[PDB]
Amino acid sequence: GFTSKDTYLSHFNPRDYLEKYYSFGSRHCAENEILRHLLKNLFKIFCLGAVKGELLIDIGSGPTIYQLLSACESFTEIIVSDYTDQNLWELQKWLKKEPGAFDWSPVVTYVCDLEGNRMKGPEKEEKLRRAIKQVLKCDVTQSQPLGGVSLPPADCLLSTLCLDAACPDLPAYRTALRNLGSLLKPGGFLVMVDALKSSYYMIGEQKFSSLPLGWETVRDAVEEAGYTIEQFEVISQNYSSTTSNNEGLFSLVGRKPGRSE
Ligand SMILES: Nc1ncnc2c1ncn2[C@@H]1O[C@H](CSCC[C@H](N)C(=O)O)[C@@H](O)[C@H]1O
Ligand SMILES: C[n+]1cccc(C(N)=O)c1
């Protein structure tokens, strides 16, 4: 049935994932086009609006940092987290500037271009490394997703391409949303990106399930979780044939309501 979290542990190859989706090279052209659009939207979200603060927690980061490049302009501290241990190790290779770490330069350069070339690649990378304070295990399915570690409430919760993969059905998706809210202060921002109407994605021969949700369904689930949707955009691009069956992606910004009861 739907991919279990133990299948992630035993099947998810971080370096392979990065090469296939985030190399930003001459192949995987559909994946490149989506990446371009994601970077554009994340730039708008984090640089052009009021999504700023002290602490941002990224949920289901996997081995990627593309989703944090504009964010580090607006947040002093970033916590990254994922369920899959090997993803966390891959991330650490890059954070620690190790030989054989994934080459993020073409992505970094693109983001720097988007932001008006106020800094160069090396400076942007240093800024993000400094911003990333913790690399933690997380499980979105749990009432306490970070295992109940003592952390201040976040000003922003970010999650990219995670919830659809981690939730077998809409009731589970609703639960994951509730679980995430436990980490966010009232007035805080929820920034989410995910595939639309996708029931699977591939990493080579390895297949991983996805919950196919249309944009209206995502809207309704987020609103019913209490969030005022401040921004919502659809990315009309599709992943490569046989790589996924998605029809576009979305990005959104929600604000958690003030405390009442
Ligand atoms: N129950 C769960 N809790 C937290 N993360 C989970 C999870 N189940 C799967 N994941 C993670 O969801 C990720 C999907 S791949 C997404 C990676 C990255 N955020 C990007 O934008 O490309 C994987 O890293 C996987 O480890
Ligand atoms: C590229 N990618 C990564 C994670 C999830 C998906 C999807 N839910 O279809 C796609």
Swiss-Prot record:
Claim: Cytoplasm is one of the keywords in the record: yes
Keywords: Citrullination, Cytoplasm, Methyltransferase, S-adenosyl-L-methionine, Transferase
Binding-site residues, S-adenosyl-L-methionine: Y17, Y22, G60, Y66, D82, T84, N87, D139, V140, T160
Top-level taxon in the UniProt lineage: Eukaryota
Annotated consequence of substituting Y17W: Loss of N-methyltransferase activity
Any GO molecular function: nicotinamide N-methyltransferase activity
Post-translational note: Deiminated by PADI1 and PADI2.
Top-level taxonomy: Eukaryota, Metazoa, Chordata, Craniata, Vertebrata
Annotated Pfam families: NNMT_PNMT_TEMT (PF01234)
Protein name in the entry: Nicotinamide N-methyltransferase
Pathway: Cofactor metabolism; Amino-acid degradation
Catalytically driven reaction(s): nicotinamide + S-adenosyl-L-methionine = 1-methylnicotinamide + S-adenosyl-L-homocysteine
Subcellular localization(s) per the UniProt record: Cytoplasm
Annotated phenotype, changing A195W: Loss of N-methyltransferase activity
Residues annotated for nicotinamide binding in this entry: D194, S210
GO BP annotation list: methylation; nicotinamide metabolic process; positive regulation of gluconeogenesis; positive regulation of protein deacetylation
Residues with PTM Citrulline: R15, R129, R178
EC number in record: 2.1.1.1
Biological role: Catalyzes the N-methylation of nicotinamide using the universal methyl donor S-adenosyl-L-methionine to form N1-methylnicotinamide and S-adenosyl-L-homocysteine, a predominant nicotinamide/vitamin B3 clearance pathway. Plays a central role in regulating cellular methylation potential, by consuming S-adenosyl-L-methionine and limiting its availability for other methyltransferases. Actively mediates genome-wide epigenetic and transcriptional changes through hypomethylation of repressive chromatin marks, such as H3K27me3.
Enzyme class label: transferase
Subunit description: Monomer.
